[PDB]
Design a protein around this ligand. Structure first.
Ligand SMILES: *[C@@H]1O[C@H](CO)[C@@H](O[C@@H]2O[C@H](CO)[C@@H](O[C@@H]3O[C@H](CO[C@H]4O[C@H](CO)[C@@H](O)[C@H](O)[C@@H]4O)[C@@H](O)[C@H](O[C@H]4O[C@H](CO)[C@@H](O)[C@H](O)[C@@H]4O)[C@@H]3O)[C@H](O)[C@H]2NC(C)=O)[C@H](O)[C@H]1NC(C)=O
Ligand SMILES: *[C@@H]1O[C@H](CO)[C@@H](O[C@@H]2O[C@H](CO)[C@@H](O)[C@H](O)[C@H]2NC(C)=O)[C@H](O)[C@H]1NC(C)=O
Ligand SMILES: *[C@@H]1O[C@H](CO)[C@@H](O)[C@H](O)[C@H]1NC(C)=O
Ligand SMILES: [Cl-]
Length: 595
């Protein structure tokens, strides 16, 4: 019996927030060319699909009473250039200065450091930008990862008050949360539970007032290979917080390390391809449909982050918990680094097309209704037109996922019945499909024989599997209805995108950049902020030597590796958007490049 999926486009039930637009990593580097390419890939996810990079040890990029912020300036400028925000963990010793947060003088000094850095980047980027940053406490305070810093229970409370008063001294508009740990049953997790008590009922180190600001509560809960287990654990902790700390009943909860499995560097075949991608989507659907979609308990769940911005290493380029797959090519003159886009990163681009209202949807099999706690599920959104540059849109994202298990032998019959699409001009739909057969760079790597130092040709062949199989825009049937019967594989993802025609064509592509990889090989990366519509077929790239169109298969990811057979890359480049009705947007400013 096939899976039946119905979507009611006429039933916009409630807001749908893109709560999953976060990644993160821990340095072992942050200014290396490897990292610069990595963050270019992360920022290239369309429509701000990844917004935050939660980065450990940021205050080891400051040296020491005056401070040198050079290395921190560099990293934060790097994020800014890629339209990314720091998940700013106030974590580090300022290169050995801080050693003890029960030393009164050190507590005052920490406050002044935090004030200085906060005011510095307010000056550097503006208060409007810095007020969006999730400042956070030291990572996992109950896992004793403090190097040479003494952090007792009392020290952690003093530290927190310095963090909070230091940020306030910069501006009251800045946001601070924590503890970013797992909240195990007492007597476990004493610093986590202690922080909440302190903020709820304790005394401020600096002011002596009862209670201390806490803008959000961050936890870490990982699935041990189970998707639904993440959600189950979060509900337990959230309820405990609600009853034990009534003032925090409406305090936003973050799970900013919500991964399928602990230990990012452990090689796992399922991390290499669409298995991981589909599980990530499944976890997100479970959170929207079983936690946020008008549940009786209604916990204030606000953010979910997959901690997968790490760079992979030899001999596991694809098998680690990373958005990209790194190849250090050591036999070129000089040695260079290349990155590939893993399906999980591509999947963040499909998620990014989900809009601000959730539509009514039901999955069933043989009359039995199945919620997102099953192998097949759906998230469906609608968009209210903003101006002449956009129109009505619907995005239906369907996953087939058995968590960390793939099933190459199996095929999942699915019948999608879309109903109630509101009438409008040039209504078309476009399907985007991912599975391990057609669109897995790891799979291509292995068909090529697993080359350790891939050639230019081998990279082209691997990159040819990055994008989803996209079907050309077809007119929507009459009555605002669409019935499709795809044969989904396990794992797979299917995005059906139904768009009405906007009045104006797409806007201008902006902030084009050329980044060198090696001889005759280069990355083109751009912003899509002013494009003004999500209904895009591809981005046309043109190259001039004295402009001709660079021929490539369709892709809406804001990054392209140009690697021509001739090796001629010197000249000027320009890029523009192309919508589902073949209408071009204006060209970006031309970017020159000389090799
Ligand atoms: C081409 O050239 C590049 C640049 O020179 C080489 O890059 C090195 O690659 C190796 C992997 O082959 C890297 O070494 C590995 O680093 C891992 C992470 O290290 C950090 O984290 C650990 C643990 O937290 C710390 O101990 C460590 O100090 C670092 O902070 C380690 O996990 C690896 O060790 C594990 O595997 C080895 C097997 O070799 C076991 O012996 C160990 O017990 C352990 O299980 C490993 O050390 C290295 O960091 C890379 N250097 C750089 C600068 O990037 C490429 O290897 C080379 N390519 C080829 C094909 O030769
Ligand atoms: C998700 O579904 C699983 C089953 O697939 C649920 O786990 C079962 O829970 C019941 C409790 O009524 C137990 O009796 C069973 O032993 C469990 N079965 C298995 C296979 O583990 C789980 O409770 C569901 N979770 C949510 C949040 O709906
Ligand atoms: C700060 O550190 C940078 C990087 O190490 C170095 O180049 C510079 O000399 C330092 N600046 C000052 C003012 O000490
Ligand atoms: Cl994982």
């Amino acid at each position: 019996a096939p899976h039946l999926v119905q979507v009611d486009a006429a039933r916009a039930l409630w807001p749908l927030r893109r709560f999953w637009r976060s990644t993160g990593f821990c340095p072992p580097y942050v200014l290396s060319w490897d990292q610069q390419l990595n963050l270019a890939y992360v920022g290239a996810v369309p429509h701000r699909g990844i917004k935050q990079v939660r980065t450990h040890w940021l205050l080891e990029l400051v040296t020491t009473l005056s401070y040198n912020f050079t290395h921190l300036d560099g990293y934060l400028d790097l994020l800014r250039e890629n339209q990314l925000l720091p998940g700013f963990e106030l974590m580090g010793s300022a290169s050995g200065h801080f050693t003890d947060f029960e030393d009164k003088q050190q507590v005052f000094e920490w406050k002044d450091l935090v004030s200085s850095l906060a005011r510095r980047y307010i000056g550097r980027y503006g208060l409007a930008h810095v007020s969006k940053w999730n400042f956070e406490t030291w990572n996992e305070p109950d896992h004793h990862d403090f190097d040479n810093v003494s952090m007792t229970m009392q020290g952690f409370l003093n530290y927190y008050d310095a963090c909070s008063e230091g940020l306030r001294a910069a501006s009251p508009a800045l946001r601070l949360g924590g503890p970013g740990d797992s909240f195990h049953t007492p007597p476990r997790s004493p610093l986590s539970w202690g922080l909440l008590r302190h903020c709820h009922d304790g005394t401020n180190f600096f002011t002596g007032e009862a209670g201390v600001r806490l803008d959000y509560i961050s936890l870490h809960r990982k699935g041990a290979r189970s998707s639904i287990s993440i959600l189950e654990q979060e509900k337990v902790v959230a309820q405990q917080i609600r009853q034990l700390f009534p003032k925090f009943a409406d305090t936003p909860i973050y799970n900013d390390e919500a991964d399928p499995l602990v230990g990012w560097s452990l090689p796992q075949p399922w991390r290499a391809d669409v298995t991981y991608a589909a599980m990530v989507v499944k976890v997100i659907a479970q959170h929207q449909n079983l936690l946020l979609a008008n549940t009786t308990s209604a916990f204030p769940y606000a953010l979910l982050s997959n901690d997968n911005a790490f760079l992979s290493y030899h001999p596991h380029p694809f098998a680690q918990r990373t958005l990209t797959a790194r190849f250090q090519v050591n036999n070129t003159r000089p040695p260079h680094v290349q990155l590939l886009r893993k399906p999980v990163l591509t999947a963040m681009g499909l998620l990014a097309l989900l809009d601000e209202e959730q539509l009514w949807a039901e999955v069933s099999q043989a009359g039995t209704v199945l919620d997102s706690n099953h192998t097949v599920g759906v998230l469906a959104s609608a968009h209210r037109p903003q101006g002449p540059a956009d129109a009505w849109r619907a995005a239906v994202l369907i996953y087939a996922s058995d968590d960390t298990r793939a099933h190459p032998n199996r095929s999942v019959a699915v019948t999608l019945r879309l109903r109630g699409v509101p009438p409008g001009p040039g209504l078309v739909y476009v399907t985007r499909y991912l599975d391990n057969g057609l669109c897995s760079p790891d799979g291509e790597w292995r068909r090529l024989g697993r080359p350790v130092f891939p050639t230019a040709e081998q990279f082209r062949r691997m990159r040819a599997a990055e994008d989803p199989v996209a079907a050309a825009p077809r007119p929507l049937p009459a009555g605002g209805r669409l019935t499709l019967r795809p044969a989904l594989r396990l794992p797979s993802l299917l995005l059906v995108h139904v768009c009405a025609r906007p009045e104006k064509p797409p806007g201008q592509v902006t902030r084009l950049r050329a980044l060198p990889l090696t001889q005759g090989q280069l990355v083109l990366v751009w912003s899509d902020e002013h494009v003004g519509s999500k209904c895009l077929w591809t981005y046309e790239i043109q190259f001039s030597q004295d402009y001709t169109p660079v021929s490539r298969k369709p892709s809406t990811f804001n990054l392209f590796v140009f690697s021509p057979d001739t090796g001629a890359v010197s000249g000027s480049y320009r890029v523009r958007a192309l919508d589902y009705w073949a209408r071009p947007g204006p060209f970006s400013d031309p970017v020159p490049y000389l090799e």
